[PDB]
Design a protein around this ligand. Sequence first.
Ligand SMILES: CCCCCCCC/C=C\CCCCCCCCCCCCCC(=O)N[C@@H](COP(=O)([O-])OCC[N+](C)(C)C)[C@H](O)/C=C/CCCCCCCCCCCCC
Ligand SMILES: CCCCCCCC/C=C\CCCCCCCCCCCCCC(=O)N[C@@H](COP(=O)([O-])OCC[N+](C)(C)C)[C@H](O)/C=C/CCCCCCCCCCCCC
Ligand SMILES: *[C@@H]1O[C@H](CO)[C@@H](O)[C@H](O)[C@H]1NC(C)=O
Ligand SMILES: *[C@@H]1O[C@H](CO)[C@@H](O)[C@H](O)[C@H]1NC(C)=O
Ligand SMILES: *[C@@H]1O[C@H](CO)[C@@H](O)[C@H](O)[C@H]1NC(C)=O
Ligand SMILES: *[C@@H]1O[C@H](CO)[C@@H](O)[C@H](O)[C@H]1NC(C)=O
Lengths: 268, 271, 127, 127, 98, 98
Amino acid sequence: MQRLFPLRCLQISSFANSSWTRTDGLAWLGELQTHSWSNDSDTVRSLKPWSQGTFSDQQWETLQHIFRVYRSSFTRDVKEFAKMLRLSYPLELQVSAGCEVHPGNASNNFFHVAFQGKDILSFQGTSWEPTQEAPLWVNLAIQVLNQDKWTRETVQWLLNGTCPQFVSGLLESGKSELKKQVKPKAWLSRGPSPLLVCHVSGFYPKPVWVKWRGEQEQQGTQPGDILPNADETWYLRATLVVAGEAAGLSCRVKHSSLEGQDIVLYWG
Amino acid sequence: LFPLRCLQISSFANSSWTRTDGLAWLGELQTHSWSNDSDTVRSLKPWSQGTFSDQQWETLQHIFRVYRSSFTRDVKEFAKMLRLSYPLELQVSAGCEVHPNASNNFFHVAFQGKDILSFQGTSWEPTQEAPLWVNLAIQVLNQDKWTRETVQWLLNGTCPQFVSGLLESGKSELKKQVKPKAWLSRGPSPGPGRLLLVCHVSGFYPKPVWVKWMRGEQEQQGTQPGDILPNADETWYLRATLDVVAGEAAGLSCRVKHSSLEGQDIVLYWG
Amino acid sequence: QVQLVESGGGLVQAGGSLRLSCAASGSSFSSYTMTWFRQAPGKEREIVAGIRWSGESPYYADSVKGRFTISRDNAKNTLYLQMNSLKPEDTAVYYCAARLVPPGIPIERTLESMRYWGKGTLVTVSS
Amino acid sequence: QVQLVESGGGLVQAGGSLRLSCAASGSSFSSYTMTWFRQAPGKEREIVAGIRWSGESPYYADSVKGRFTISRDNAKNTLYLQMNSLKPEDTAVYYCAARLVPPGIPIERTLESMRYWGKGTLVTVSS
Amino acid sequence: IQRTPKIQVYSRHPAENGKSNFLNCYVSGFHPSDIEVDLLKNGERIEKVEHSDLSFSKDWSFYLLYYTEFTPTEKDEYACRVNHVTLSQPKIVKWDRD
Amino acid sequence: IQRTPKIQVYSRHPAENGKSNFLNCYVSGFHPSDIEVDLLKNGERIEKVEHSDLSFSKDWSFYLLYYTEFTPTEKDEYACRVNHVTLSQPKIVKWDRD
Ligand SMILES: CCCCCCCC/C=C\CCCCCCCCCCCCCC(=O)N[C@@H](COP(=O)([O-])OCC[N+](C)(C)C)[C@H](O)/C=C/CCCCCCCCCCCCC
Ligand SMILES: CCCCCCCC/C=C\CCCCCCCCCCCCCC(=O)N[C@@H](COP(=O)([O-])OCC[N+](C)(C)C)[C@H](O)/C=C/CCCCCCCCCCCCC
Ligand SMILES: *[C@@H]1O[C@H](CO)[C@@H](O)[C@H](O)[C@H]1NC(C)=O
Ligand SMILES: *[C@@H]1O[C@H](CO)[C@@H](O)[C@H](O)[C@H]1NC(C)=O
Ligand SMILES: *[C@@H]1O[C@H](CO)[C@@H](O)[C@H](O)[C@H]1NC(C)=O
Ligand SMILES: *[C@@H]1O[C@H](CO)[C@@H](O)[C@H](O)[C@H]1NC(C)=O
């Protein structure tokens, strides 16, 4: 009986040309955004009262300096790579890095880099590895990156040491919000005849089950995407049809917050 | 003039078969031979070491021994890095020439028979019309400051000193003069009633020579000179032909000018 | 990022005391793991002490426990080594070293990861 | 290609003598240009002496002429530094270094081109 | 390669005329990140509009949530206008009630 | 790229029946380097045949000198047989005395 809340650190670096660049970042713990990192800011910004976890102020300031130096150095290194490898602007680079702490204290991590929306390389163990079937210039990038023994040591420290300890503190500091349960409210509506539509909004966390008569569920239900609300809740629309059969159909909603008391809405 | 030309022929049939062979030319004489089946560069002349001491020569032997194995290893890594398919053929032409004063050197690399890059100054530079992947190779090669320093030392320092020592140790053979011997022959008729006068010149050293069919002081501008071909004893051979009406084939002579003759040209008259 | 300059070395008698100092030039000195190394005559360079963030127990080599104390003044960008009960085997060139180490790493696993070094100061223990 | 290990460092009184040795592991030790460097406390590393092939005059820094002698035993793959009339300003960590230099290059032009280094040994001249 | 944005408009609560509510515009699945999103009331841009931080999914495509406080009436029509390099002209998705 | 070999046959000294001589076959200007050269006497391969070290010119094309000691007679015919990827059939170049 346990759920996983991985820490995903996302970086969005855009290079319009050699003189216009910006880097923005975010941190997700499970489905909750815990940090925000704007290009016009000197520091990573905490979005939750518990976003610092159990790190001390000095420990957190150390990470601030590491990320501050990393952002400027990453920007400079990309511009040199584009000149070194003769890659034409614009350049779009994304980083997805983090770790997860499994119940029982096991840990594992990841560090994936994308170029123009495609994986090109990742950090595996102590070195950088190219993505399978990657462009030829990535081999030169890997060749240059693995010569940097200080960066390789720092990345390994962050993934294998800093991140698991950070997550462990966050799981305890934000335990109330991470395990919170918010009950959804539902309502029915009409749609263009090909169509019964069942709305479900306001639930937290994200996992939900919605399907359309008594004990028989019409397997032709069309579930939509789980869409976000501004208050960190979620919204889902489910649609369904022969005109005569619609009489007597019902929408059933299963969610963890309901404690077994399913929401049942009958049409009419 | 006697430039030093060091030639390398490296063949890679696949990832598990390769051989590197080399030779050195001083002017027109081959002074060294470098076989893949040998641990050392082999001297072809008693004076092939120049004025280098035994310790100086052993230093060069170790440098070339390490270079051959490292070159082979680096090429196979480049083929994997750049996704180049076997077989691979690489040629290197390096050396220098001392002028009696200014000096100049060169280090050209060819891939599949085409120039790809060369050593200019202190770094490697790609050929203007080289494939796109060569830039990635150039970028890797220029990271190696030790090799760049060693290549500059060899071209700008070792090579000019080696040439000077060779010119001193091999002065007798390099300044040798060998007189050519000539003889006349008949050839396939150029046409109806026409004759092909053939003049052979063989055994001369060094290579520069002058051969023309002449009538007295008038040089038959229709003389057909062939290629200067090598003999096994490091001399040369040259054939000169002339198409001519059979009647005109009278009073015609083959004249040979060579440095070894000291102005006493060889004149062979037809008939 | 960090430049280190040791000072305070000199001649001291056995059983005496001496204080070494290390002035660091850089941006975020308080974030750096700071260490002292020493190389005795005829011996290999070895770690002496290490310090990081407030509240953490500093590292000490067994040969200097109870005699040497490492400390730092982050307001002055200065690292200190207070050497008490000096022995003749403490004669060495003492080096200041630094490395930016993120949280979650034990200090004893970073002693071989120093990046920036000072040029050293000589301490001689007579008698 | 070549691994270097210095030995012989230790404590010596002013005016005394001490010989350093450097054991080299490699293929053609006699082909390598061998040098001695030293780094004094608070000072940058600097060249002391250099030697190459038999018959060539070794290089000596002006500060060590007439006092230090560099030599090599190619049969034993060993480099030596004989240090006589030692002064307190000779206190430094002495490093063994090597570089494969082809013929035709003056030794003075290769002193900044050393490639392989030993970890060094400390010599301290007291009094 | 480039990916065109998916645009979905929805309200936080069920639409009740005279009751305050939030209008959401969720733009997802686009690449590259540069994008212009505006919320429209009767074709004119709404001033007080907030957006979440730009993020991206596992497949590296970006997504963004825009939202604004509003009180719907019977005649007011709301729409979300999105511009992107993959669009030859601004794509306008109207908010359909019910 | 491929270059077909140029093949030239000649003797060291003028041909005199009963006097020892050397027969040369000079193969030049070819690419790639793999090549087969044989000297034939009355259609049979000559056993003691030597060749210089493989070399190449400024334009990177290869050249080779093959030679053998021989004593010609009035009826003996000598030829040089060369095979190369650029040749559909082995090229036989006969030694012309005149
Ligand atoms: C790990 C997370 C811990 C907890 C985080 C809590 C806060 C979360 C909030 C926001 C997160 C935002 C996203 C963060 C992403 C991960 C950050 C990792 C930081 C690692 C820092 C290492 C040290 C450092 O910052 N290193 C930098 C400085 O090193 P240096 O100064 O020693 O030397 C620089 C010069 N040199 C030539 C490189 C030697 C270094 O320059 C970075 C390199 C970038 C490494 C990744 C590159 C990947 C490939 C790029 C593309 C190449 C091809 C381009 C073609 C056009
Ligand atoms: C010429 C000097 C005068 C004396 C001559 C005496 C007569 C000799 C007789 C005949 C010789 C005939 C051949 C001679 C050729 C020239 C020899 C030069 C030797 C230079 C030695 C340098 C030091 C060394 O030996 N260099 C080697 C060892 O260095 P290393 O051990 O430090 O390892 C380097 C590894 N690293 C990852 C690269 C850093 C080095 O590995 C080769 C470098 C290659 C240099 C040429 C490259 C040209 C292009 C290659 C192909 C690219 C594309 C590939 C596509 C698949
Ligand atoms: C670089 O891009 C920015 C933003 O796209 C633009 O404002 C600027 O003019 C560009 N600079 C050049 C030199 O093209
Ligand atoms: C992002 O920040 C860097 C560093 O402050 C700056 O140079 C760059 O112009 C910024 N990008 C913008 C303003 O788009
Ligand atoms: C590689 O080349 C060698 C030499 O031509 C040959 O014997 C071998 O069959 C080739 N293939 C492999 C897989 O070794
Ligand atoms: C050439 O020499 C190398 C090194 O000794 C060897 O590995 C290779 O097999 C040789 N090539 C042959 C025998 O064809």
